[PDB]
């Protein structure tokens, strides 16, 4: 499996890259990308039962602390891993270069989605209004919430005086587990397609946007991937070791999701695999159940590091000192944008504006707008990497709060 | 419990009221309404499983009569309680006078709701086309219907020749009961937040519309509340007592629903609590499972009483003789719009036009428009009261048909 | 039933027919059609749970072959039965004649549906993106797919070394079967309404379009019906008989679905009755569970026949030679459109264009557009017949792939 995917990944990225230089970009998109979609598709499909079932059951564990404790632990873990990652980006963007060379074609045309939901209508939006609707619409947040409340609820019912009560409660709680179980059985079968999918998936990415990783972009591309590489070593290997956990047992188990998350670019779409991985490394369904999903949307260290290295790239190709010292605002805003950024195909660059405006350079004065347009050119490239470091870091922390609680 | 809420209630009312007389209305809203929202959120959530689950189970009771009997009983009980209520509000509107004080500013703007669905595509719309969708979209009517057809079906399945058919039936039927059971477990938990919720809720209501209970409205305001008051004494207590049931054990057990319905204003959103109260006083799940939901949308004695007093208020501020003798039309159309009115936040005043134009005064002729416009200024206040009489009345007739059948 | 359904259909088709010849069409439509709608509503209701549940369960049978084998078989079966039907239409439309009587009214108006989703965005669209969304949205295909994958997934879970895995698996698998079981109990119940519905339903159709089946249209009408009849004897009996299964016993056991489908016109909405008929003749729930739905959208021998007799009707009123020899284009295109045509109210006529344009005469050349607009007059008439030969042949194919595999 891991060799058939790697065989696919490598020979793919190569087969792609050739065609992009021979001008077959469009022809890879009309013939190859679908085979790679059937994969992204066949994954998205498991996201909803798997997440749901494996968390109502996931209130197996001790309500008050376990969950509550595990939560407070991984939330603090998430925030720090995020904040650090942008700092490591901020620096990486100094060492390796963004780009001082002047951006040509002024006026790229970048729209203003200022109608950005008020923070209150987001936090309040975390409580479902129809667990069923929320359930049948994606919405892997309220769905998380309702699962927990339903789980905790089921647990209490089993400690009841009545024999009736605890019986029907265990019928349901079992049935829900049937699903939970049945779902992984699938994540496995539909993982076998991953080779073809992976190959076909990058065949597009490279033959469409790789054939442009040159100029100052090449510097940035590299300025990001190196920044990324370090985030794994300097942060995940470093925090794993001190936490009594084997870095090679880690990055060999999670070697499955690690890749899916890189070819798909959908952190959220990778969730079924990410969750099989956590399960297939013996973590309690009370941890990986409320950590990976809550994290498949909060912890985006990779995106944050990317947001840092990108604030400088526009600050350079614009001509500011990046408000030296007050680039701790970037450190902050990029942590705030991390949370927000949604784990869909490629919306980190979109949610990158909030940070850009915080350093002082809005997406409207067409110098900033036309420089941004260049970043968006090398984005299928940039994302892959960060959308790994995004899923990896969520496991790193599941593995921590694993041993811990 | 009832005290923690009562403390919050009275104290909130005062806190609000004062802030509204100092000009802090927009600050309560931006700050305090969300705590009251989180409450309504947390309830709206349980509305869908609770209704579904506790009704498939609800087909424990004897298919033919019980349901078929209890049904026809509670509809007659409902229609009359609604008719009585508007008559009682017409009386209450002649005695306590609405207001012959000539309408002020001419320019209210009220578009015509003529596109009010045909009765055909309303009755037929009671049969769901996708129980799963009807299930996952609110729609607590077709959902009611399916639940019963599912139950009754699960009932026949147990009396089967095969032991497998009867086994699986009892699996499902049980699992379903898990949810239902589990869902009340939450009604009790989420009930604990209510004090903070309640306080936060009226805090807004009063410091936004309470600080406007003046002019002719103050009369109408009171003209309505005194009517509502009687509707509890003269009808509910009187019809409770006569059927061999204790009015004080009633208002003692149903104290919870009554209040949540008063602050929420959501008759429908109060359904979980209301349904716990029904079970928390021993009505069989074969009755409160099909009376309260079907009642949270048909029986709205309060709205009809509020719809009575309000047709006159415009007949007074317009100079119409309230079409003496032919005000039996209000009596009818209000019983007809009662039904129609949906237990959402505040649509009694909207569904009022059906009754208004039936009396002769159309919502288009600027005089009526500008009359209506004032009533709608003091609505949060006006609604709270009738929202109570609305939930209350559903319990009353469920308590009647409790003893009867 | 059987005779009350027949008594309703016969007297109804007449009661209708009469009112039309006197001018009351619209009245039949305001008072009668609703009863015949409450039937179609009461069927459509069970198409979603009956389909899903009777197929997760339907992964009773041997994963590898059985399914796969059964699958490859029915598809070849369908593709041949379809292709034959049209050929049988072409012929039937050469012997019986469309019309050499020149189209009159030029000025009918037909908007070009050039936006016809690509075959790729249809085939990838067969895999759900949220089984729950697709569950709650019709989508009796994505849902078919996810069922099989959750069924097969559950089977393996049952042969698990753990006892926990195999317990919760059989709890779930049972709960699902409960519904599947319950859902047939209903199809029986709401099948009793059938005579009322049937009666009311042809009452409309006849008294609104029957009183128009005259002239070259009456010829066409007969040409399509004589053609359909022949598709039944010459292909269904003659293909049942050869495969060793009694025709009279087949067209006796499926006289139920056979009729609902003729009065409903919705092959898709008839499904629950079609599935009960399958079960009630003893086909394994692992065949009729994945042959009938994946047939209520792909196998439409009826539509296809009607598509050949129509492509001929136009090239006659228009005066072409129907591209003689190359009407095997139609033969092909029709089978291709048959698949596409989806078993809803009356859209075979809509999807007819693709065949027409392939033959040569597009729907926008105001001549063709006016011939076609006549065909669309006697449509629910033509539809009834082909919406039978449509379902009938979806069983015939399950009756073969029953015996064989």
From Swiss-Prot, chains A, B, C:
InterPro entries: Na-dicarboxylate_symporter, Na-dicarboxylate_symporter_CS, Na:dicarbo_symporter_sf. The chain crosses the membrane at residues 1-19, 31-51, 70-92, 111-149, 186-207, 220-240, 287-309, 381-401. GO terms for cellular component: plasma membrane. Changing residue 394 to N: Strongly decreased affinity for aspartate. The keyword Transport applies. Na(+) 2 binds at residues 297, 341. GO terms for molecular function: amino acid:sodium symporter activity; chloride transmembrane transporter activity; identical protein binding; L-aspartate transmembrane transporter activity; metal ion binding. Residues 52-69, 150-185, 241-249, 279-286 are cytoplasmic. GO terms for biological process: chloride transmembrane transport; L-aspartate import across plasma membrane; L-aspartate transmembrane transport; protein homotrimerization. Disulfide bonds: none annotated. L-aspartate binds at residues 265-267, 303, 344, 383, 390. Sodium-dependent, high-affinity amino acid transporter that mediates aspartate uptake. Has only very low glutamate transport activity. Functions as a symporter that transports one amino acid molecule together with two or three Na(+) ions, resulting in electrogenic transport. Na(+) binding enhances the affinity for aspartate. Mediates Cl(-) flux that is not coupled to amino acid transport; this avoids the accumulation of negative charges due to aspartate and Na(+) symport. In contrast to mammalian homologs, transport does not depend on pH or K(+) ions. Contains eight transmembrane regions plus two helical hairpins that dip into the membrane. These helical hairpin structures play an important role in the transport process. The first enters the membrane from the cytoplasmic side, the second one from the extracellular side. During the transport cycle, the regions involved in amino acid transport, and especially the helical hairpins, move vertically by about 15-18 Angstroms, alternating between exposure to the aqueous phase and reinsertion in the lipid bilayer. In contrast, regions involved in trimerization do not move. Homotrimer. This is Glutamate transporter homolog. It comes from Pyrococcus horikoshii (strain ATCC 700860 / DSM 12428 / JCM 9974 / NBRC 100139 / OT-3). The lineage of its organism: Archaea, Methanobacteriati, Methanobacteriota, Thermococci, Thermococcales.
């Amino acid at each position: 499996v891991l060799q058939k995917i790697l065989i696919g990944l490598i020979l793919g990225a190569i087969v792609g890259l050739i065609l992009g230089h021979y001008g077959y970009a469009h022809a890879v998109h009309t013939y190859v990308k679908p085979f790679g979609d059937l994969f992204v598709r066949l994954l998205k499909m498991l996201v909803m039962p798997i997440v749901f079932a494996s968390l109502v059951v996931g209130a197996a564990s001790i309500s008050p602390a376990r969950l509550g404790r595990v939560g407070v632990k991984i939330v603090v873990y998430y925030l720090l891993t995020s904040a650090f990652a942008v700092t490591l980006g901020i620096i990486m963007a100094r060492l390796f270069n963004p780009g001082a060379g002047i951006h040509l074609a002024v006026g790229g045309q970048q729209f203003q989605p200022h109608q950005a939901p008020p923070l209150v209508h987001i936090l309040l939006d975390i409580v479902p209004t129809n667990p069923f609707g929320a359930l049948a619409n994606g919405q892997v947040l309220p769905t998380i919430f309702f699962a927990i409340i339903l789980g905790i609820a089921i647990t209490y019912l089993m400690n009841s005086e009545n024999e009736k009560v605890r019986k029907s409660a265990e019928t349901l709680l079992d049935a829900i587990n049937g699903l939970a179980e049945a779902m992984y059985k699938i994540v496995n079968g539909v993982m076998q397609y991953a080779p073809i999918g992976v190959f076909a998936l990058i065949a597009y990415v490279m033959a469409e946007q790789g054939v442009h990783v040159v100029g100052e972009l090449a510097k940035v591309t590299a300025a990001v991937y190196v920044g990324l590489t370090l985030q794994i070593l300097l942060v995940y290997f470093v925090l794993l070791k001190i936490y009594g956990i084997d870095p090679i047992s880690f990055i060999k188990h999670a070697k499955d999701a690690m890749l899916t998350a890189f070819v798909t670019r959908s952190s959220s779409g990778t969730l079924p695999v990410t969750m099989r991985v956590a399960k297939e490394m013996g973590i309690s369904e009370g941890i990986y159940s409320f950590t990976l999903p809550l994290g498949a949307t909060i912890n985006m260290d990779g995106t944050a590091l990317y947001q840092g290295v990108c604030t400088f790239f526009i600050a350079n190709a614009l001509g500011s000192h990046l408000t030296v010292g007050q680039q701790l605002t970037i450190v902050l805003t990029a942590v705030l944008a991390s949370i927000g950024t949604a784990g869909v195909p490629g919306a980190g660059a979109i949610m990158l504006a909030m940070v850009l405006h915080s350093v002082g350079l809005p997406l409207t004065d067409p110098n900033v707008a036309a420089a941004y347009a260049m970043i968006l050119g090398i984005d299928a490239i940039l994302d892959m990497g960060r959308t790994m470091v995004n899923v990896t870091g969520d496991l790193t922390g599941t593995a921590i709060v694993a041993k811990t609680e």
